[PDB]
Design an enzyme around this catalytic site. Structure first.
Site, PDB file in Angstrom:
ATOM      1  N   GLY A   1     101.545  92.787  96.942  1.00  0.00           N
ATOM      2  CA  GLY A   1     100.292  92.254  97.432  1.00  0.00           C
ATOM      3  C   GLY A   1      99.460  93.262  98.192  1.00  0.00           C
ATOM      4  O   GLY A   1      99.292  94.401  97.761  1.00  0.00           O
TER       5      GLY A   1
ATOM      6  N   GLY B   1      97.832  96.051 100.424  1.00  0.00           N
ATOM      7  CA  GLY B   1      98.259  97.383 100.803  1.00  0.00           C
ATOM      8  C   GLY B   1      98.597  98.296  99.639  1.00  0.00           C
ATOM      9  O   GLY B   1      98.305  97.990  98.482  1.00  0.00           O
TER      10      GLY B   1
ATOM     11  N   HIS C   1     104.885  98.347  89.706  1.00  0.00           N
ATOM     12  CA  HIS C   1     103.607  97.767  89.300  1.00  0.00           C
ATOM     13  C   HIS C   1     102.426  98.598  89.800  1.00  0.00           C
ATOM     14  O   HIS C   1     101.505  98.908  89.046  1.00  0.00           O
ATOM     15  CB  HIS C   1     103.497  96.333  89.820  1.00  0.00           C
ATOM     16  CG  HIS C   1     102.299  95.602  89.320  1.00  0.00           C
ATOM     17  ND1 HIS C   1     101.349  95.064  90.162  1.00  0.00           N
ATOM     18  CD2 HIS C   1     101.891  95.305  88.059  1.00  0.00           C
ATOM     19  CE1 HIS C   1     100.412  94.473  89.446  1.00  0.00           C
ATOM     20  NE2 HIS C   1     100.720  94.598  88.169  1.00  0.00           N
TER      21      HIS C   1
ATOM     22  N   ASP D   1     100.803  94.008  84.214  1.00  0.00           N
ATOM     23  CA  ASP D   1     100.956  92.719  84.881  1.00  0.00           C
ATOM     24  C   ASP D   1     102.096  91.909  84.267  1.00  0.00           C
ATOM     25  O   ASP D   1     102.853  91.256  84.976  1.00  0.00           O
ATOM     26  CB  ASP D   1      99.648  91.926  84.822  1.00  0.00           C
ATOM     27  CG  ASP D   1      98.545  92.542  85.675  1.00  0.00           C
ATOM     28  OD1 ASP D   1      98.826  93.496  86.435  1.00  0.00           O
ATOM     29  OD2 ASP D   1      97.398  92.058  85.589  1.00  0.00           O
TER      30      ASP D   1
HETATM   31  C1  LIG Z   1      99.120  86.522  93.543  1.00  0.00           C
HETATM   32  C2  LIG Z   1      99.702  87.699  94.287  1.00  0.00           C
HETATM   33  C3  LIG Z   1     100.433  88.568  93.293  1.00  0.00           C
HETATM   34  C4  LIG Z   1     101.157  89.671  94.022  1.00  0.00           C
HETATM   35  C5  LIG Z   1     101.168  90.901  93.143  1.00  0.00           C
HETATM   36  C6  LIG Z   1     102.495  91.618  93.271  1.00  0.00           C
HETATM   37  C7  LIG Z   1     102.447  92.936  92.521  1.00  0.00           C
HETATM   38  C8  LIG Z   1     101.586  93.953  93.242  1.00  0.00           C
HETATM   39  O1  LIG Z   1     101.273  93.787  94.451  1.00  0.00           O
HETATM   40  O2  LIG Z   1     101.174  94.983  92.631  1.00  0.00           O
END
Ligand SMILES: CCCCCCCC(=O)O
Ligand SMILES: CCCCCCCC(=O)O
Lengths: 122, 122
Positions: A29, A31, A47, A89
């Protein structure tokens, strides 16, 4: 965008994506990256490294097409960058599902992200 | 940084900042701005506009010093940008506290932020 990403995570994990991963650990999320707290956190690490390779589209804001076929994420159409984005994703949604067994609530809501050890280069 | 901002919000509201505001509405937490959902959301709208005037520092990762004195946030920076940053964060913490009475849990965890109506220029 955040929407396709969140929906993928929901479809795979069955969990509200923003609640479980919106501020999780050192990598999920809000950061940048940091030393991963656990396997779930490492999914998000990978990711964000995946996002760094993208050229020609904005992983935060750009919309794209995918579908759910035979309970599988199927990236659609799109162009070069949006396809790569979609696959980024998809991979994290799968990874997060695979590591639900060690998911730890205590890593939710981590506004202490600035204290994370600096991440290694991607 | 996210830490000082989170702590201020916690100190003022008494609520875990990342849980209540990490993905709230169209303006709180992850992402950019959008048409505010409510008064709480407008607090975050103002906050993100506040961040735009900052020059010389980075609001997301830069640490700074403030103190909690007589249950009041007191910024303690003699760095103009960090001082400005501190005051930005103080103001949103106060605003969020002031609008707790209309805080709505249904706006928590909004990974549908990309569907928000486009925000006006700051
Ligand atoms: C709806 C929130 C989704 C969190 C994404 C987790 C992967 C990331 O942070 O790259
Ligand atoms: C860890 C708390 C995050 C909430 C930040 C809300 C203000 C903003 O979005 O600019």
């Amino acid at each position: 965008s955040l929407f396709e990403l969140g929906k993928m995570i929901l479809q795979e994990t069955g969990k509200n994506p923003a609640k479980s991963y919106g501020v999780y650990g050192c990598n999920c999320g809000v950061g940048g990256r940091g030393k991963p707290k656990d396997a779930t956190d490492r999914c998000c690490y990978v990711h964000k490294c995946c996002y760094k390779k993208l050229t020609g589209c904005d992983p935060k804001k750009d919309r794209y097409s995918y579908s759910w076929k035979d309970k599988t994420i199927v990236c659609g159409e799109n162009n070069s960058c949006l396809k790569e984005l979609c696959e980024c994703d998809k991979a994290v949604a799968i990874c997060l599902r695979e590591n639900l067994d060690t998911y730890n609530k205590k890593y939710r809501y981590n506004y202490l992200k600035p204290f994370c050890k600096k991440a290694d280069p991607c």
